[PDB]
Design a protein around this nucleic acid. Structure first.
Ligand SMILES: [Cl-]
Ligand SMILES: [Zn+2]
Ligand SMILES: [Zn+2]
Ligand SMILES: [Zn+2]
Length: 122
DNA sequence: TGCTTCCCGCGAATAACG
DNA sequence: CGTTATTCGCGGGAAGCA
């Protein structure tokens, strides 16, 4: 295909034939390989930019709307992504949101049309 | 060296198939 | 049309960048 398989200790890795990156999941290799082949394009709906992964485009479009989905539950401040939220909580509140810490709320995305995870609304 | 974007295992949502 | 196949949102560490 666009990969070969490597097997060590009875565990299978899928290896990208172009850059030789390894993947535990074949769907991950397929997702990655678009970067090489560009057989699918994900163009921004607000500007001319085009991305090789759907999620890169989504994260990018959020910047166009200015929606702040990530909210610190200690002081209420909201942030556009996980990284700014995490940086805030570690720096201002001296706490780590990783694991399940319940230190932040991820609101559903309302400023554009993306797939909605049920767990975000209740 | 602090933003900024990328990366990939995981699995819920949904499209494609029957 | 219920069943499987596919897509891609999410965490949170890594890498890129000026
Ligand atoms: Cl908002
Ligand atoms: Zn590759
Ligand atoms: Zn854009
Ligand atoms: Zn806060």
């Amino acid at each position: 295909d666009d990969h070969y398989e490597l097997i060590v200790d009875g565990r299978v890795y899928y290896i990208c034939i172009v850059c030789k990156r390894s993947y535990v999941c074949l769907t991950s290799l397929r997702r990655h390989f678009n970067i090489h082949s560009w057989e699918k394009k994900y163009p921004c709906r607000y500007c001319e930019k085009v991305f090789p992964l759907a999620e890169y485009r989504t994260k990018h479009e959020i910047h166009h709307t200015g929606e702040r989905r990530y909210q610190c539950l200690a002081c209420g401040k909201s942030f556009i992504n996980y990284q700014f939220m995490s940086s805030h909580i570690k720096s201002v509140h001296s706490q780590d949101p990783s694991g399940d810490s319940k230190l932040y709320r991820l609101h559903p995305c309302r400023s554009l049309q993306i797939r909605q995870y049920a767990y975000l609304s209740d």
